[PDB]
């Protein structure tokens, strides 16, 4: 559920993304696809939760006479009951859905890192800080090909094989 390592204050163009470091320099670059899906989903969720709470026409209070006391306590009970029900619903939905929003975001992290895992199996080495070191040279074009999900494993398979075996 909870999938966190650390945050990037320098990536200012999206919820999720990449930090690339090659011989052409380093930089932050947001993944617009997963960030976009997340914004769509969260917007629809928020709008659904809010817009379901619609309003009727009920001047709330009533004031009854001295021969309508039990009538009056019933009406105050109804007011307070609708109060408590709507308060209860709002509180619990906010709690639950904040939990679920954070968990959804964690799973988005996990899915992005899985995608980069899949494009790059043995051509790179995974690190416990949730990163990859290429066994080959990944230039800007290679980086972009990984970012838009079009990396070419056989393209660098031989170079990565050579360097990977070279480590040992």
């Amino acid at each position: 559920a909870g999938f966190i390592e650390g945050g990037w204050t320098g990536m200012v163009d999206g919820w999720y993304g990449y930090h690339h470091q090659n011989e052409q320099g380093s930089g932050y670059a947001a993944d617009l696809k997963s960030t976009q899906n997340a914004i769509d989903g969260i917007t629809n969720k928020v709008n659904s939760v809010i817009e379901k709470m619609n309003t009727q026409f009920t001047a709330v209070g009533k004031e009854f006479n001295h021969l309508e006391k039990r009538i009056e306590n019933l009406n105050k009970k109804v007011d307070d009951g609708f109060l408590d029900i709507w308060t209860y619903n709002a509180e619990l939905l906010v709690l639950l859905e904040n939990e679920r929003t954070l968990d959804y975001h964690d799973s988005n992290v996990k899915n992005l890192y899985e995608k980069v895992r899949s494009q790059l199996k043995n051509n790179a080495k995974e690190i416990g800080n949730g990163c990859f070191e290429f066994y080959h040279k990944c230039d800007n074009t290679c980086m972009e090909s990984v970012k838009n999900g079009t990396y070419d494993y056989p393209k660098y398979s031989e170079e990565a094989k050579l360097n990977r075996e070279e480590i040992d």
Partner: antibody, heavy 121, light 108 residues
Framework: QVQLQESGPGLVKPSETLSLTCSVSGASISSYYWIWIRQPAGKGLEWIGRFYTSGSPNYNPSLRSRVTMSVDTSKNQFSLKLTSVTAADTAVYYC???????????????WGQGTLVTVSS | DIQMTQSPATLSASVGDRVSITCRASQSISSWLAWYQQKPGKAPKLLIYKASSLESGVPSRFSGSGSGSEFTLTISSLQPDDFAIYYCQQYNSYPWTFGQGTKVEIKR
């Protein structure tokens, strides 16, 4: 409030490298992407491109190599450089700041003055 | 990438009249359209983001309705100051492209 002023020559000869400088007051360049915008005559706007200090630039696929965007964190400016300007490259230029993430995606609230670049001998 | 049809190119409408500008797209934009009021010879002013989000300081007469490929900007009561050229921007993907713009005049 952040202010963006624009400096351009006014005339660029038809086979020269246009150099434009947007000066930034009230903000640090190293913290924002910076955007260039273009308007030929009174027809439609066109997003030129985006650049960031510790990030990766992206420009219009229409204008890729000709365009190089650079940043002076010293002078608090960012410059746009266009190789081999043309008559079609005659237009108004605007520089804008790319804001950070909001719930409505990335916004461009802050806009430059607009400077005319004329490509004439 | 994404070509922009902004109809109609030129309008003239009396004061108080509702005005509707349609912005159709090449592919799917979800709700990632922006709307700018470029007054004559000035910088464009962002009217609406996220398609259905009014920016702070904008009169509530401006409303934005649409998702996917079709969108409409609607001015509830057209006022004198609302004479300008109105563009619809796309930030769903790069390159960000604008519409040709709609020229809003006022019949008097």
């Amino acid at each position: 409030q952040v202010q963006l002023q624009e400096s351009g020559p006014g005339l660029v000869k038809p086979s020269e490298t246009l150099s434009l400088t947007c000066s930034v007051s009230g903000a640090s360049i190293s913290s924002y992407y910076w955007i260039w915008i273009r308007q030929p005559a009174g027809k439609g706007l066109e997003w030129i491109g985006r650049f960031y200090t510790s990030g990766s630039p992206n420009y219009n696929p229409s204008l890729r190599s000709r365009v190089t965007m650079s940043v002076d964190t010293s002078k608090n400016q960012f410059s746009l450089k266009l190789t081999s300007v043309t008559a079609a490259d005659t237009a108004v230029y605007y520089c804008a700041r790319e804001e950070h993430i909001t719930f409505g995606g990335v916004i461009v609230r802050y806009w430059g003055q607009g400077t005319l670049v004329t490509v004439s001998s | 990438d994404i070509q922009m049809t902004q109809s109609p190119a030129t309008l003239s409408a009396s004061v108080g009249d509702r005005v509707s500008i349609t912005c159709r797209a090449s592919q799917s934009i979800s709700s990632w359209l922006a709307w700018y009021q470029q007054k004559p010879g000035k910088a464009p002013k962002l009217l609406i983001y996220k398609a259905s989000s009014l920016e702070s300081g904008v009169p509530s007469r401006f409303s934005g309705s649409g998702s996917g490929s079709e969108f409409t900007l609607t001015i509830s009561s057209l006022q004198p100051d609302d004479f300008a050229i109105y563009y619809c921007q796309q930030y769903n993907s790069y390159p960000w492209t604008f519409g040709q713009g709609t020229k809003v005049e006022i019949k008097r």
